[PDB]
PDB file of C-alpha atoms (C1' of nucleotides) and ligand atoms in Angstrom:
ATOM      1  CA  UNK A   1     115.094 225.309 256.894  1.00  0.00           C
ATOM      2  CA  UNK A   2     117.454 224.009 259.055  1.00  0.00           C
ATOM      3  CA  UNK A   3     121.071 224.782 259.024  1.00  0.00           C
ATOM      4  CA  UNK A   4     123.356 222.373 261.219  1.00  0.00           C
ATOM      5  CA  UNK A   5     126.874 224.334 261.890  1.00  0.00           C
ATOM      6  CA  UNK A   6     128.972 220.715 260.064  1.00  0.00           C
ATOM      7  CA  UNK A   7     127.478 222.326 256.870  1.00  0.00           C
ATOM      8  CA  UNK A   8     129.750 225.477 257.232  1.00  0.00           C
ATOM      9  CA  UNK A   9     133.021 224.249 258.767  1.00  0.00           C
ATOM     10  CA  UNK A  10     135.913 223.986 256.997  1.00  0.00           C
ATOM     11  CA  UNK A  11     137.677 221.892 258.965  1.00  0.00           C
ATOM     12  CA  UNK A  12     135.277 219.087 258.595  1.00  0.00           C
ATOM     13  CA  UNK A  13     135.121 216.952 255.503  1.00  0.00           C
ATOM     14  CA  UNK A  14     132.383 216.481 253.173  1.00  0.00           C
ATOM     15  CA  UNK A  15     131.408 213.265 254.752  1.00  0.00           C
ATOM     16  CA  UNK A  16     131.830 214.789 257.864  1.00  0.00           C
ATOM     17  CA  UNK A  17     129.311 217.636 257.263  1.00  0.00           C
ATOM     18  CA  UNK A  18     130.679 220.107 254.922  1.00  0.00           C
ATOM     19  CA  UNK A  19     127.608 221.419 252.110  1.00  0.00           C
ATOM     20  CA  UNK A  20     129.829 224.385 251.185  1.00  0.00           C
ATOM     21  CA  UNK A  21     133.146 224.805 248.820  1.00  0.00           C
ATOM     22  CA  UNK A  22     136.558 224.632 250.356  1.00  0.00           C
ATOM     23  CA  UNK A  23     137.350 228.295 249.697  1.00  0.00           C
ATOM     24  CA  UNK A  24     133.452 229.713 251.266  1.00  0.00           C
ATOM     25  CA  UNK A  25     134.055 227.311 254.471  1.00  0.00           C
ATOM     26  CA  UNK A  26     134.394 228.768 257.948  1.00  0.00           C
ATOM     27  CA  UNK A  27     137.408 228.622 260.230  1.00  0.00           C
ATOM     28  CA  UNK A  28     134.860 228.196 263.346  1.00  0.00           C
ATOM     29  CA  UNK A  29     131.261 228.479 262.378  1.00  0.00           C
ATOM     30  CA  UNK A  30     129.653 229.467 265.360  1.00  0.00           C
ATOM     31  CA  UNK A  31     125.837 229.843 265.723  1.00  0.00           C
ATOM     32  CA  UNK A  32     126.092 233.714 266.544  1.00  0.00           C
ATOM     33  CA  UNK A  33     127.567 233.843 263.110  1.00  0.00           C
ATOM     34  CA  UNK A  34     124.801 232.106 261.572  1.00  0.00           C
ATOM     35  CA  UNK A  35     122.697 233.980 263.200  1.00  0.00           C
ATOM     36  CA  UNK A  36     124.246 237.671 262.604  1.00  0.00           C
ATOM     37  CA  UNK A  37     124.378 236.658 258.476  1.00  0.00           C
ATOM     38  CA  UNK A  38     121.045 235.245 258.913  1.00  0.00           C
ATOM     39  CA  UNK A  39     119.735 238.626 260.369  1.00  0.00           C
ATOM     40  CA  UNK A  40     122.154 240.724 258.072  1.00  0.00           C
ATOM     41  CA  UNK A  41     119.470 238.798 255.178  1.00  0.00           C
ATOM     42  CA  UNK A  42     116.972 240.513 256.500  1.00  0.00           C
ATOM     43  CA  UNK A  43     115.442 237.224 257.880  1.00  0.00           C
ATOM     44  CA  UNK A  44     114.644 235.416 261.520  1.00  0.00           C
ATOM     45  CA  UNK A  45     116.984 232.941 262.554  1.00  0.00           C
ATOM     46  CA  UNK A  46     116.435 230.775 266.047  1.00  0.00           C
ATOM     47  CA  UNK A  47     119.038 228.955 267.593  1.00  0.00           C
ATOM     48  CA  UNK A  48     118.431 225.774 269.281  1.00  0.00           C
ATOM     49  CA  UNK A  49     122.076 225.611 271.624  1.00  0.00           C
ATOM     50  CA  UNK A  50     121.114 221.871 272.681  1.00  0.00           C
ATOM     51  CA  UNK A  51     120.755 219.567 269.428  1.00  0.00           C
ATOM     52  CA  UNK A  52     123.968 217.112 268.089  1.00  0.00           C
ATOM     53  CA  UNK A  53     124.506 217.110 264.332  1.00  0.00           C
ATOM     54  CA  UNK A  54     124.187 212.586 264.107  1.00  0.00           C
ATOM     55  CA  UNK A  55     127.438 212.378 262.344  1.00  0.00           C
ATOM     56  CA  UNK A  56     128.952 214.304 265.562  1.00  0.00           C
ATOM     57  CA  UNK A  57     126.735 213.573 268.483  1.00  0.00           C
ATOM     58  CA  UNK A  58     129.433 213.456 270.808  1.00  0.00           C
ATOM     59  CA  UNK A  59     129.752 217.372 270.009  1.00  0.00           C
ATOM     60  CA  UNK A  60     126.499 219.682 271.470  1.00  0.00           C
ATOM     61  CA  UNK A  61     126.908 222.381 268.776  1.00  0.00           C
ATOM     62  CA  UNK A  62     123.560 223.734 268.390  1.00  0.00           C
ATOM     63  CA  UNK A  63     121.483 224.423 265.102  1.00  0.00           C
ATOM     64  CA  UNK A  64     119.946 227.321 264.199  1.00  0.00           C
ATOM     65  CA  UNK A  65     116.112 227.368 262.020  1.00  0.00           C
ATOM     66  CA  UNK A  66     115.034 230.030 258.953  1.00  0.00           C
ATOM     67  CA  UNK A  67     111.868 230.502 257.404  1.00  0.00           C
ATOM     68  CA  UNK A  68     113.960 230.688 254.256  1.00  0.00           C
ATOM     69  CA  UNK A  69     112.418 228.941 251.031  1.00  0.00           C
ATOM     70  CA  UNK A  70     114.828 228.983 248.397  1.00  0.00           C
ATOM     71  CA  UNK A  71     118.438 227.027 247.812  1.00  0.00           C
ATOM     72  CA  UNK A  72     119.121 225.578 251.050  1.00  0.00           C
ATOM     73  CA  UNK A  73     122.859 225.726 249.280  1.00  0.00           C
ATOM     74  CA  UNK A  74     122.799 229.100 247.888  1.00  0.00           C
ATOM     75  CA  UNK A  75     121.494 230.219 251.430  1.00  0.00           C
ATOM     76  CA  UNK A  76     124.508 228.645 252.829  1.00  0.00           C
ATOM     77  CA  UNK A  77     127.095 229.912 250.855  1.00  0.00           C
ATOM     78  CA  UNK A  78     125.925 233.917 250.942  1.00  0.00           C
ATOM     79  CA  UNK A  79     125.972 233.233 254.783  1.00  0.00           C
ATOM     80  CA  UNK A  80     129.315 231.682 254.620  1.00  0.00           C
ATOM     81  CA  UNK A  81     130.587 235.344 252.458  1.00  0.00           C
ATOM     82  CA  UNK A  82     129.485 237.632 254.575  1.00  0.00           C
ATOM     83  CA  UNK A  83     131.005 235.909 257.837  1.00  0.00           C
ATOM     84  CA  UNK A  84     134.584 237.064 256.074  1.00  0.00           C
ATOM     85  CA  UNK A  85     134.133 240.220 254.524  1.00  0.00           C
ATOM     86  CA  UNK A  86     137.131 242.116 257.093  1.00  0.00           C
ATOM     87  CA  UNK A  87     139.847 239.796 258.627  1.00  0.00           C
TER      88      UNK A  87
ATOM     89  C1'   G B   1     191.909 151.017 226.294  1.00  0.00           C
ATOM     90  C1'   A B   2     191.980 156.058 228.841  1.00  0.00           C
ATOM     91  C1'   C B   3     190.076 161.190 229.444  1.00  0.00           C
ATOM     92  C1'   A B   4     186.776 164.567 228.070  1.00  0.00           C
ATOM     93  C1'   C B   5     182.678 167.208 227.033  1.00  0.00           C
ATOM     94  C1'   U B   6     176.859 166.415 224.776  1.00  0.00           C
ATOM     95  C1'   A B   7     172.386 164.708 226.423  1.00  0.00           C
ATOM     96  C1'   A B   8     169.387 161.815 229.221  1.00  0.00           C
ATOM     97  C1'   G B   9     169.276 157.270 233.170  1.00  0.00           C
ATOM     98  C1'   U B  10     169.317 156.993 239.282  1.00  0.00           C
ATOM     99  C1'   U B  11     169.540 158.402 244.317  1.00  0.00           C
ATOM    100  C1'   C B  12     168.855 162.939 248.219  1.00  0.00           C
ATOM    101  C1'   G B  13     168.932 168.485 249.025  1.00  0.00           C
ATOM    102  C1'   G B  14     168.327 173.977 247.651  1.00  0.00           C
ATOM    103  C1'   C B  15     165.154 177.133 245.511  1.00  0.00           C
ATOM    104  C1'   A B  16     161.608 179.493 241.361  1.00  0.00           C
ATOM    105  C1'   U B  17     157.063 178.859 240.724  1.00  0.00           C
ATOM    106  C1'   C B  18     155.955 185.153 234.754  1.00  0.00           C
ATOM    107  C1'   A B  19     157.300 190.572 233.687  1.00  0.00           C
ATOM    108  C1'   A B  20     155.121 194.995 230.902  1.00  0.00           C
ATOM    109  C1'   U B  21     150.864 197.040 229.452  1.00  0.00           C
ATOM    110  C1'   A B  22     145.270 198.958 227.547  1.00  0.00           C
ATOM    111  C1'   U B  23     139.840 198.877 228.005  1.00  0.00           C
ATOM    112  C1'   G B  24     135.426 197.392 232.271  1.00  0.00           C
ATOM    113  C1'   G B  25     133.246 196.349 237.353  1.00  0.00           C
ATOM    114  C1'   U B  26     133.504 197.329 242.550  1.00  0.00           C
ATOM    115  C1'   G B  27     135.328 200.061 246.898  1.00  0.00           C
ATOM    116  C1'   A B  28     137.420 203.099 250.738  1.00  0.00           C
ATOM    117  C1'   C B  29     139.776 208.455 251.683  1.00  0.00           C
ATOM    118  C1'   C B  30     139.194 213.164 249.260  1.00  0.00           C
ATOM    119  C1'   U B  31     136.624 216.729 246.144  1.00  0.00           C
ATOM    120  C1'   C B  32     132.142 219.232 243.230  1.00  0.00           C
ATOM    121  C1'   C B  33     127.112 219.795 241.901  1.00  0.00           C
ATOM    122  C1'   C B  34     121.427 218.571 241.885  1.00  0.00           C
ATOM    123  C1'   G B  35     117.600 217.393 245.276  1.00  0.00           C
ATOM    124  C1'   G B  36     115.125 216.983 250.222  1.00  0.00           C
ATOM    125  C1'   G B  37     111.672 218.767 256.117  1.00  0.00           C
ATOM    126  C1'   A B  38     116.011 216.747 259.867  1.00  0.00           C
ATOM    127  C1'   G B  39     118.659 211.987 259.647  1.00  0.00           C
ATOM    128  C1'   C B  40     119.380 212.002 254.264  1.00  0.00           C
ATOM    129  C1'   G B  41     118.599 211.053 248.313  1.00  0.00           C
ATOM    130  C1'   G B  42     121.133 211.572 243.334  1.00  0.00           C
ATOM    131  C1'   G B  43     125.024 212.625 239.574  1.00  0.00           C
ATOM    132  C1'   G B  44     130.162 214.024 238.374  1.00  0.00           C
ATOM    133  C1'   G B  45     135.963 214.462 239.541  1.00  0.00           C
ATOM    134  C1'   A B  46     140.388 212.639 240.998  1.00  0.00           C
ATOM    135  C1'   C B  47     143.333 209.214 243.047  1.00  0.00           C
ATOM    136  C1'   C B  48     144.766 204.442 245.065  1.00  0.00           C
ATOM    137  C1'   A B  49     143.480 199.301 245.919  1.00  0.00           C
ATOM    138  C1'   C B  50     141.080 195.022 244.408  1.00  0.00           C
ATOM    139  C1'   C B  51     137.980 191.579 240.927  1.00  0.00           C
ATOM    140  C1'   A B  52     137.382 190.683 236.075  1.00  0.00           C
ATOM    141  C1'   G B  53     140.550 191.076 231.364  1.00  0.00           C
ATOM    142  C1'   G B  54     142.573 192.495 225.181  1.00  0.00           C
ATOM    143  C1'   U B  55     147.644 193.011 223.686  1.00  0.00           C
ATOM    144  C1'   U B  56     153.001 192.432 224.370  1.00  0.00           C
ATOM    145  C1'   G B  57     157.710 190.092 225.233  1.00  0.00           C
ATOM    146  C1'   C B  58     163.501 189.774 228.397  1.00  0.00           C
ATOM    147  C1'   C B  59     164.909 188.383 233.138  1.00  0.00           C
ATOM    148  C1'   U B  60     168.923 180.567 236.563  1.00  0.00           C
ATOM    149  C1'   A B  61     163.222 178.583 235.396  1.00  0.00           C
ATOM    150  C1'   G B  62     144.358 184.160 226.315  1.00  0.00           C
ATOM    151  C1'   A B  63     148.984 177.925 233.553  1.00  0.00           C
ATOM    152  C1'   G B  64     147.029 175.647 238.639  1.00  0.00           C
ATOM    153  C1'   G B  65     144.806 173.472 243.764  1.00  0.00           C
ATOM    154  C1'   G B  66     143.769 174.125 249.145  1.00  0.00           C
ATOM    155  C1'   G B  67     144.502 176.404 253.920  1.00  0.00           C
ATOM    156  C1'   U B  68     145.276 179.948 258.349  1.00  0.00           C
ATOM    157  C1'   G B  69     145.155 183.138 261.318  1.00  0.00           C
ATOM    158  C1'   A B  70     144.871 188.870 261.577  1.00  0.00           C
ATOM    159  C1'   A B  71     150.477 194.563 261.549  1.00  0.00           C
ATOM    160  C1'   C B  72     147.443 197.506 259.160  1.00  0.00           C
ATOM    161  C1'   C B  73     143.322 199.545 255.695  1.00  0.00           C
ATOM    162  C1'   G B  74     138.286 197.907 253.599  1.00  0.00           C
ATOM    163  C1'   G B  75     132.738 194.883 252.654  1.00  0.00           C
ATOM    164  C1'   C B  76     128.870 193.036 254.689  1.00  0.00           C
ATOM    165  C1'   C B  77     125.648 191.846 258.699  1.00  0.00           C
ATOM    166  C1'   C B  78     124.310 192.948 262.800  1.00  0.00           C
ATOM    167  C1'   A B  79     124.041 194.520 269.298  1.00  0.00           C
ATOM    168  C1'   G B  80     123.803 197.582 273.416  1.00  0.00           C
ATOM    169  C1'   G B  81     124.536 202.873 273.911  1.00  0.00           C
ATOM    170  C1'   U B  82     124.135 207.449 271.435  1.00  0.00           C
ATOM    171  C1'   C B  83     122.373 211.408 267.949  1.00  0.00           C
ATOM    172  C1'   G B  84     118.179 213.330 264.021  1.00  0.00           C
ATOM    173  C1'   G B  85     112.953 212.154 263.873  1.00  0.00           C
ATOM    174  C1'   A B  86     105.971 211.915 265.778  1.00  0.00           C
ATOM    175  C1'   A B  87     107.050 207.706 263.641  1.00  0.00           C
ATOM    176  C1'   A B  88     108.831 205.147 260.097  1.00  0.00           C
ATOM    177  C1'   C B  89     113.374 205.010 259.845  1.00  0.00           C
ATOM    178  C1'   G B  90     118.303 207.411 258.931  1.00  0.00           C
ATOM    179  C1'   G B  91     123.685 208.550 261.328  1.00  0.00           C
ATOM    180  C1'   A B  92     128.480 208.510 263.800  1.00  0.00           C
ATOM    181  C1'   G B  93     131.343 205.035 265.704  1.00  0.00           C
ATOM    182  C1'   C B  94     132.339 200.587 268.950  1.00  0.00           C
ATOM    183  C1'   A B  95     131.879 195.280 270.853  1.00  0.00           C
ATOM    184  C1'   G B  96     130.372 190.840 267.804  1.00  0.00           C
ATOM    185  C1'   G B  97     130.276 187.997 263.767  1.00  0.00           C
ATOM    186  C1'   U B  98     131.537 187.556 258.377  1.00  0.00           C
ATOM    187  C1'   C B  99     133.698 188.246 253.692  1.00  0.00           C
ATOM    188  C1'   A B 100     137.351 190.091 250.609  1.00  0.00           C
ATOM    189  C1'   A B 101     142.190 191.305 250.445  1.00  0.00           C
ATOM    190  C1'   A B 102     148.081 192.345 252.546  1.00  0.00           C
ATOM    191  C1'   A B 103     150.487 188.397 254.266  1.00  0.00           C
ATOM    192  C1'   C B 104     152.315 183.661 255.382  1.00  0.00           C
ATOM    193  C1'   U B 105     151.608 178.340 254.487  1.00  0.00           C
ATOM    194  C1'   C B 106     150.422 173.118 252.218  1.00  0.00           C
ATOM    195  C1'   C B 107     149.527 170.468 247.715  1.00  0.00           C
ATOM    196  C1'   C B 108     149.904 169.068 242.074  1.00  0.00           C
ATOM    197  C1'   G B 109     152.170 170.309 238.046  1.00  0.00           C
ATOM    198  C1'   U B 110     156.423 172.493 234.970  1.00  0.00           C
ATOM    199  C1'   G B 111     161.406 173.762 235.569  1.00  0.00           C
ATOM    200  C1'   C B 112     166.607 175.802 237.487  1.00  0.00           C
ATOM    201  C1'   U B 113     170.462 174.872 240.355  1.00  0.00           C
ATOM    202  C1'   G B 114     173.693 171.638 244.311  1.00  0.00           C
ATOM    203  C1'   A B 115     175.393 166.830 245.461  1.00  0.00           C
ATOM    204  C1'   U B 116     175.190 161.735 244.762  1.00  0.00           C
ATOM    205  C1'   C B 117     174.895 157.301 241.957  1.00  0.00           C
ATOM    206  C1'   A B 118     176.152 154.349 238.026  1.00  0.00           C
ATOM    207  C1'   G B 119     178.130 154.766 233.693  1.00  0.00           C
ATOM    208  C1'   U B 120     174.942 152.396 228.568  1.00  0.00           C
ATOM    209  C1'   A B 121     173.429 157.398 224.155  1.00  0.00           C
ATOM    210  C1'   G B 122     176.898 161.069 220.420  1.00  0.00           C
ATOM    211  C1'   U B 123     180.842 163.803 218.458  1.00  0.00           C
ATOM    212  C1'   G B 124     185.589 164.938 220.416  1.00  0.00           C
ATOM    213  C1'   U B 125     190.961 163.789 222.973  1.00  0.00           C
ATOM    214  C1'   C B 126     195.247 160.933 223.282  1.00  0.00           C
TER     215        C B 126
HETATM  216  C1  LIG C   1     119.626 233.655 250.282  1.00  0.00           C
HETATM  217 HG1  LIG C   1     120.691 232.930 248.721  1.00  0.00          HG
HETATM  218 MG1  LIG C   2     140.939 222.884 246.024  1.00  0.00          MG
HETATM  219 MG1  LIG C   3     134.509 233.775 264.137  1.00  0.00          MG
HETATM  220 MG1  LIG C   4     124.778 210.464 249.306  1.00  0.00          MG
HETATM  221 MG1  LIG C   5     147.725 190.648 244.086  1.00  0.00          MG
HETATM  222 MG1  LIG C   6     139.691 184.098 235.422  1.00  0.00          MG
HETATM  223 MG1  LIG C   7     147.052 188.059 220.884  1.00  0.00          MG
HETATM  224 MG1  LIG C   8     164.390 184.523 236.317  1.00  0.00          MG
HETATM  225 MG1  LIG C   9     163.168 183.834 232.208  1.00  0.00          MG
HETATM  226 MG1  LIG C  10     170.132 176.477 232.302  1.00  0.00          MG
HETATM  227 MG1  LIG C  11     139.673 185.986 228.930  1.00  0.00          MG
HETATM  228 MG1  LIG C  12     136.385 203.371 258.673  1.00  0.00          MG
HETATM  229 MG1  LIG C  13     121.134 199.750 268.395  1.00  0.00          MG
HETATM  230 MG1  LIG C  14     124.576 198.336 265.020  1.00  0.00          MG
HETATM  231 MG1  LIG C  15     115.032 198.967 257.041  1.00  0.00          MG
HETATM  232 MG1  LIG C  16     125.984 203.244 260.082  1.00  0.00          MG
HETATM  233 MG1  LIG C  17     134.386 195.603 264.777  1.00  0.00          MG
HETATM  234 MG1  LIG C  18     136.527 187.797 268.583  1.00  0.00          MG
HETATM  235 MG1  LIG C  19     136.633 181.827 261.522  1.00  0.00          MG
HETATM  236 MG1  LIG C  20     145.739 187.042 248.708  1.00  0.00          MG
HETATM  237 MG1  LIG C  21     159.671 180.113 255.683  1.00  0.00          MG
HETATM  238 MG1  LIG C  22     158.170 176.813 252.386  1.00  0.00          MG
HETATM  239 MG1  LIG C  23     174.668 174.736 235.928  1.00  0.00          MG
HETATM  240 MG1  LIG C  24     178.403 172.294 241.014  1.00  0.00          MG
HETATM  241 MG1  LIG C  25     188.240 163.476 214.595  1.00  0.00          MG
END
RNA sequence: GACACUAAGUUCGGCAUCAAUAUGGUGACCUCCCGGGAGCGGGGGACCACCAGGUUGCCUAGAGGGGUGAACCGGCCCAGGUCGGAAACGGAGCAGGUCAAAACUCCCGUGCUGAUCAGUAGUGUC
């Protein structure tokens, strides 16, 4: 499963990226984030720092990789609650 | 005879060339879900344009015909580059073309109004 950061942010538009509700998105999604909820699942992430989501290839924001078979959405959004779960 | 008004009859300008509303199609921006290995695929929501269009009736007045570039936004095609991919291909946006539409123009038609002619049509006036 692969989980480009766009699908996270909420500061990108649905075209732009966003696979997750307005009020789950992330102010910065970073891929130490994805990676600490990830691992806070009790599964493996791997980053891969140089990769370019297409619809933003200007932008080198990596990508990180699970083994993960189940809702690619569902996976997002429980990653997406427990980045905020303590301002 | 004379003067009016009521049309119309010339001769030249000035302009206008429907408004108000349902249903349907398409499309950007936005939003939500279902699906997929990545790029993506699919369905819904709202809104605002536009193309079709049933009904309704006032504004000096189930109706047209061309055209152009180009404030801006959009379709479509399609480079180079670039990104995802093993590849097929798919993407973000440009240059390029192209269409639609904003817009502005020309034409025909129907009229309104201004002047100019003459003064026949009709009831008035003295
Ligand atoms: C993991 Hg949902
Ligand atoms: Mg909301
Ligand atoms: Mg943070
Ligand atoms: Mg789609
Ligand atoms: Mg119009
Ligand atoms: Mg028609
Ligand atoms: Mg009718
Ligand atoms: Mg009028
Ligand atoms: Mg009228
Ligand atoms: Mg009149
Ligand atoms: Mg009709
Ligand atoms: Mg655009
Ligand atoms: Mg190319
Ligand atoms: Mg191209
Ligand atoms: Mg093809
Ligand atoms: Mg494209
Ligand atoms: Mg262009
Ligand atoms: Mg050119
Ligand atoms: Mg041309
Ligand atoms: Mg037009
Ligand atoms: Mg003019
Ligand atoms: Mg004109
Ligand atoms: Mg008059
Ligand atoms: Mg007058
Ligand atoms: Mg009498």
């Amino acid at each position: 499963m692969i989980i480009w950061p766009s699908y996270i942010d909420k500061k990108k538009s649905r075209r732009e990226g966003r696979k997750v509700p307005e009020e789950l998105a992330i102010e910065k999604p970073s891929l130490k984030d994805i990676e600490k909820a990830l691992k806070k699942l009790g599964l493996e992430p791997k980053i891969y720092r140089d990769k370019r989501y297409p619809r933003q290839h200007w932008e080198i924001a990596g990508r990180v990789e699970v083994d993960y078979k189940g809702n690619k959405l569902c996976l997002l959004k429980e990653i997406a609650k427990i980045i905020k779960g303590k301002n």
